[PDB]
Structure formats: C-alpha cells, structure tokens
Design a protein around this ligand. Structure first.
Ligand code: NIL
Length: 264
C-alpha cells in the first residue's frame, strides 16, 4: 500500500478548529515540513471505510488524501491542510469587498466541478454543505466530508430515522424515504448556493424543522437572497425541484457556472 506512511514521519500538534471537527489535529509531515490535517481514531470498520473510499477519489476541488496509518492503532487519515479552513466560517468572517460577487461565483463553479466529477464516479456525497467545504489560497475551494452528524452542537443535525440529519439541506425523498442519490446531492448543492449567496446565513430562517417537509411539499422554497444574480437563483430553484429526475445534473450545473463565470 503506497498510502501507508510512517506514523513517526508526523509531528502531531493541536486539535483543529478548536475541536469542532472532533479528533482531527494539525500535524507537520517532517519529511517535507508540511502542515497537514490528521484524523485519528480516538468505529474501526467505518474509519477504514473512510480511508478506502478516499483512496479512489482525486480532484483539484476535493480534499487531498496524503496518506494513512492503519497498520496498527491509533489509526490515522492524513490530508492536506487548507489555510482558511471551512467555507461556512470563511464566508461569515470574510471581507466582502474582497470576497465579492465574482468571487462567490468562482467558488460555486469550483464546487460544481468537484460534484460533476463525483457524479461521473457514481459517488453519492450525502452531506454537501458549506460546513463540509474548505478554503485555500486564492479562493481555492474544495469539497470534503468531516462526518459532522455526531459531533456538531446546535440544531444543524437533528434526530431522524435512527441517525442525525441536517434537515434543512436534505432532499424530500431523503427525508421521507431515506433515499439518497446524486439528485439528493443536487438538492443540497442548491442549499449550498444559498449559503454562499448570503455569506453563510442559516437556511429557512425562523422556520422550525418540524414544518419544513410540509412546506416543501406545498412548493414553498427560499426566496432569492439580496444581490444574488437571477441566473444563480434560477439554478437554485431547479436544484430544488420536488421530483429528483426534474433536477439538473452536476454536468449541466457546472457548464452553466462556467458560462456565467466566463461572461463576468
Ligand atoms: C465512507 C465515506 C467517506 N467519505 C468521505 C470522506 C472524506 N474525508 C474528509 O474530507 C477528511 C478526512 C480526514 C481529514 C484529516 C480531512 N481533513 C480535515 N478534516 C477536518 C478539518 C480539516 C481542516 C480544518 C482547517 C484547516 N484545514 C483542514 N481537515 C478530511 C471526504 C469525502 C469527500 F468529500 F471528498 F468526498 C468523502 C464518504 N464516504
């Protein structure tokens, strides 16, 4: 296994994000004095599944697997470390003059490119959201999956069907039937686009979780955010079509963002 690496090659430092990611630590890969992120096992089959899945996925806009220590405990998964951290906090904390409308569009385009690649792989993300994306230099954005549903405080994730779901990002068939697919990822992408356009406001503001499904079923959808371009809102609306087969593919979504970005 070319992925196995020397646990000793890594100096472990502090928990990242002051603990909001669980057992993930800042590390230095001494061999290259490279700051990395290291997820450790504090659920063994689930952790090894994560590592195996990450070996088969590779894209400029997906978080980069660098290695694993799974030959003996405690197991590690090591990825690149993204300077600016998670997209949700980034948006909330940014200088909006720097991170302006053209930049927002560029972020969305990058996310759609990763999703297009995952769609080509028949890979189902299941938890697409700003909280699961990372920001690097020059507004580089990558999709990731921090396995947040058991750690996160608040009512982001709530009890549903025996697990915890981010109800407000979840497609109606995924809520009702536990049916997840590339098209439920498209639905969540539309919510992500609204997160981006509002610089990380919480979706369906003020609307209790217990009422969301019934509203959606009556064709209630979030309104266009202030200053979100019309074409971008049109794409949100398409992503939130009730019937999954009515939603666009990520190939179509990426092409549309590419065209809009070219024209800006
Ligand atoms: C069974 C299974 C697994 N996955 C899946 C796992 C991941 N993993 C991580 O992103 C992940 C794993 C380990 C580490 C160390 C990291 N890196 C990490 N985790 C938390 C925070 C940070 C961080 C914070 C601030 C600055 N830089 C990095 N990095 C990511 C990523 C994906 C995705 F999105 F790409 F498809 C999918 C899906 N199904």
């Amino acid at each position: 296994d070319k992925w196995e690496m020397e646990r000793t090659d890594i100096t472990m430092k502090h928990k990242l994000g002051g603990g909001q990611y669980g057992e993930v630590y800042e590390g230095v890969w001494k061999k290259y004095s490279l700051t990395v992120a290291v997820k450790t096992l504090k659920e063994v089959e689930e952790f090894l599944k994560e590592a195996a899945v990450m070996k088969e996925i590779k894209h400029p806009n997906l978080v980069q697997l660098l290695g694993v220590c799974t030959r003996e405990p405690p197991f590690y998964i090591i990825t690149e470390f993204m300077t600016y951290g998670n997209l949700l906090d980034y948006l909330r904390e940014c200088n909006r003059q720097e991170v302006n409308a053209v930049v927002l569009l560029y972020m969305a385009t990058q996310i759609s490119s990763a999703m297009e690649y995952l769609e080509k792989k028949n890979f189902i993300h299941r938890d697409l959201a700003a909280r699961n994306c990372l920001v690097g230099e020059n507004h580089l954005v990558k999709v990731a999956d921090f396995g947040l549903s058991r750690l996160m405080t608040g009512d982001t994730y709530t009890a549903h069907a025996g697990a915890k779901f981010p109800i407000k990002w979840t497609a109606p068939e995924s809520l009702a039937y536990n049916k997840f697919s590339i098209k439920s990822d498209v639905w969540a992408f539309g919510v992500l686009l609204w997160e981006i356009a509002t610089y990380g406001m919480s979706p369906y503001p003020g609307i209790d979780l217990s009422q969301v499904y019934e509203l959606l079923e009556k064709d209630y959808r979030m309104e266009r955010p202030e200053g979100c371009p019309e074409k971008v809102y049109e794409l949100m609306r398409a992503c939130w079509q009730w019937n999954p087969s009515d939603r666009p593919s990520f190939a179509e979504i990426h092409q549309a963002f590419e065209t809009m970005f070219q024209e800006s």
